[PDB]
């Protein structure tokens, strides 16, 4: 194990490179197995998704094989948490399909905020429970007959702001999930030419 | 096997129920019972005199039925050469029944458990009060009997008086007639004496334990000279055995002649054990009602539903409760339903018309629920705990709670 498998992994990546002349480098990021399965089910017919390591630092060996240049441009961009998407359809269409899929995934306590997150005026869906968790920071909440109702549309977290722990937990209890993303596109490979999501 | 024993018990329980219902004429029946030690010839002699005296019964019907009943039992007893262990229970007669069917009947059987009860009777009906009284009191108690001469071990069902094991010992003298050696010999005497307690305690673990969990519901020490007290409170005595020590009896005499003295003294305390186990259980049930908790049930509407569903852990029942399981049936459509009814709701009830269709819904005959609980608690959740109305907690459970409840496996919600 892990000598024959390592050789089998080299055979997987080279065959995918030989089959498809176009690849889409996608950042994995905070991602679930459930997400990856959903993406597999959506992109089943056309594309083939892969997730690699520093044996993707091995496109060099494909470029060595009595043929290819152009794969030399792709070596620096295999950094961070990276996985590939091999495919033959198109480039701008596939970019739109990747952007369109995505997933919610609830608040990460500590990380940055991508958009201006809000709390709409609505009931929590509980009995006479702790209103003190909501009112600790600066939110107007009443016990309007049993249910804890928020009485105003207020912005908690703004763009480029750090998400606190107590406010993250309250958003998770409310089922408000603007944070996270799913997966991001950093760079592209299209028959030799490189693009930067443009 | 344990399962085969339970089937043999149920077989006899069923048989017993059918014999109590029997009924017959004048005093044509016989209820005869023989203990295991007894000789059959002596019994066959007794019946031969009872046959002779019966020859001068004035009334016809009775006389001829009696003599034939006495001849049958005499012939059944010819087949056995000895009275078997567990005794013998002979039930002869000529029972009247439906269809005007005055039929002869004979049931000799060696019962399960040993019986220490003799009985000769004739009557209009059979008398199985001995057998049913046995079947209730399965509770065995142990009897360790210490003496400076030698020990004894035996057990004690409600009826039967057993001997398990006994030994005698060559113990030393009280005194040592030297000044210096007095002390050494006195220590030596006390070490021999302690080794004897150890042996008795070891043999007691040998006898009274079963699968690292003692069979005897209690245990009694019975002696004199603070020798039982040596055993009772010693660290030598295994705590699983020691925790069931209920009485330390003070007896004159020793061994098997002291044994039956120890039983006579220990009677009230050995009767109270069932009453104590009742209190402990219903006390445990009532604590759940005292707190919020919600790991309880009560009423045949609830307690059964709880048993049907996410099952109970313990199913408390009062003997007397009288609530019964009928099976109702339709004439035309062949629809049916079973319900658990009270004494007045079962005797006469205009509820049972089918209504939706418009027919009379005939209530096909019952069986009554204590019996139903016993039939299939094993196929539910189990520990069918029969309790009485004697204890203060039991009295509440019977009078207040309707004599039915349960301690559940977890919390359960109920509505309506």
């Amino acid at each position: 194990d892990r000598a024959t498998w390592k050789s089998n992994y080299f055979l997987k990546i080279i065959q995918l490179l030989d089959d498809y002349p176009k690849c889409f480098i996608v950042g994995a990021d905070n991602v679930g197995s459930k997400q990856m399965q959903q993406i597999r089910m959506s992109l089943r017919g056309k594309a083939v998704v892969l997730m690699g390591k520093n044996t993707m630092m091995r496109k060099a060996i494909r470029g060595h094989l009595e043929n290819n240049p152009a794969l030399e441009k792709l070596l620096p961009h295999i950094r961070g948490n990276v996985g590939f998407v091999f495919t033959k359809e198109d480039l701008t269409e596939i970019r739109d399909m990747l952007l369109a899929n995505k997933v919610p995934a609830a608040a990460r306590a500590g990380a940055i905020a991508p958009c201006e997150v809000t709390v709409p005026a609505q009931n929590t869906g509980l009995g006479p429970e702790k209103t003190s968790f909501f009112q600790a920071l600066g939110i107007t909440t009443k016990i309007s007959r049993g249910t804890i109702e928020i009485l105003s549309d207020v912005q908690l977290i703004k763009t480029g702001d750090k998400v606190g722990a107590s406010e993250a937990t309250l958003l998770n209890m409310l089922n408000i999930s603007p944070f996270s993303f799913g997966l991001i596109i950093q760079q592209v490979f299209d028959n030799g030419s490189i693009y930067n999501p443009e | 096997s344990a399962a085969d024993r339970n089937v043999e018990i149920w077989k006899i329980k069923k048989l017993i129920k059918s014999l109590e219902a029997a009924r017959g004429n004048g005093t044509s029946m016989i209820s005869l019972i023989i203990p295991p030690k007894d000789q059959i010839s002596r019994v066959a002699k007794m019946l031969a005199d009872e046959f002779g005296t019966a020859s001068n019964i004035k009334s016809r019907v009775n006389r001829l039925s009696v003599l034939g009943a006495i001849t049958s039992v005499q012939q059944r007893l010819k087949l056995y050469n000895k009275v078997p262990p567990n005794g013998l229970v002979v039930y002869c007669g000529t029972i009247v029944t439906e269809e005007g069917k005055e039929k002869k009947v004979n049931i000799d059987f060696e019962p399960f458990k040993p019986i220490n009860t003799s009985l000769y009777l004739c009557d209009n009906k059979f008398h199985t009060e001995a057998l049913t009284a046995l079947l209730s009191d399965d509770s065995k108690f142990g009897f360790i009997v210490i003496d400076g001469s030698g020990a004894l071990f035996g057990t004690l069902q409600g009826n039967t008086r057993e001997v398990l094991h006994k030994f005698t010992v060559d113990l030393p003298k009280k005194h040592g007639r030297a000044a210096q050696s007095a002390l050494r010999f006195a220590r030596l005497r006390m070490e021999k004496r302690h080794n004897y307690v150890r042996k008795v305690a070891e043999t007691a673990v040998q006898l009274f334990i079963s699968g690292d969990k003692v069979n005897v519901a209690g245990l009694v020490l019975a002696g004199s000279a603070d020798f039982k007290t040596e055993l009772s409170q010693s660290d030598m005595f295994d705590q699983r055995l020691q925790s069931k020590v209920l009485k330390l009896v003070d007896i004159s005499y020793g061994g098997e002649n002291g044994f039956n003295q120890a039983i006579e003294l220990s009677t009230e305390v050995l009767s109270n054990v069932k009453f104590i186990q009742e209190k402990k259980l219903i006390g445990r049930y009532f604590d759940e009602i005292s707190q919020d908790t919600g790991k309880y049930c009560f009423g045949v509407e609830d307690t059964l539903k709880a048993l049907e569903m996410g099952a109970v852990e313990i199913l408390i029942v009062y003997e007397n409760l009288d609530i019964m399981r009928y099976v109702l049936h339709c004439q035309g459509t062949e629809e049916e339903k079973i319900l658990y009814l009270t004494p007045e709701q079962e005797k006469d009830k205009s509820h049972f018309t089918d209504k939706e269709t418009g027919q009379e819904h005939e209530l096909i005959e019952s069986m009554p629920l204590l019996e139903w609980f016993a039939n299939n608690y094993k196929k539910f959740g189990a520990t069918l705990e029969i309790v009485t109305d004697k204890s203060q907690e039991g009295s509440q459970f019977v009078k207040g709670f309707g004599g039915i409840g349960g301690i559940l496996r977890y919390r359960v919600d109920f509505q309506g």
Partner: protein
Amino acid sequence: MPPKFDPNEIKVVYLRCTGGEVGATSALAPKIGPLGLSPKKVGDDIAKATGDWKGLRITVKLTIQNRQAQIEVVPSASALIIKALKEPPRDRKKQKNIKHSGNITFDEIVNIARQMRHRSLARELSGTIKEILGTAQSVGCNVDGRHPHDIIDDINSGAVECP
């Protein structure tokens, strides 16, 4: 169903499993049952009627409540349908030694099993599904007198027929 007692439509589903016969220990209704208008004994009788004459060796019970009428269905599990297609039927009470005979062939019968799978598996068609259901069998032991393991590798059938 939220505030007090209201059916706006009620096509409510919940998943019970196991149901050869009525069952004394039941555990069918409560919790979900009574609140929602489905009863207990009648619901057990309806559950027996659907899961009657096959399967009597364990079944699955999705319960779609239409206000008061439950629609019990048998959604297929792989091992259940293998046990249904065994050497039937010695149902209950001996029995006893035990339910693991496991020499009942099924070569082209498992083709139907891979077809009846509710898509699932993230597969590249039956070629891979054949390998899965040929090993799901804890009991069966594959064809006539074969093993499962590595005979699966050399399949020569039903690649294009199963879609």
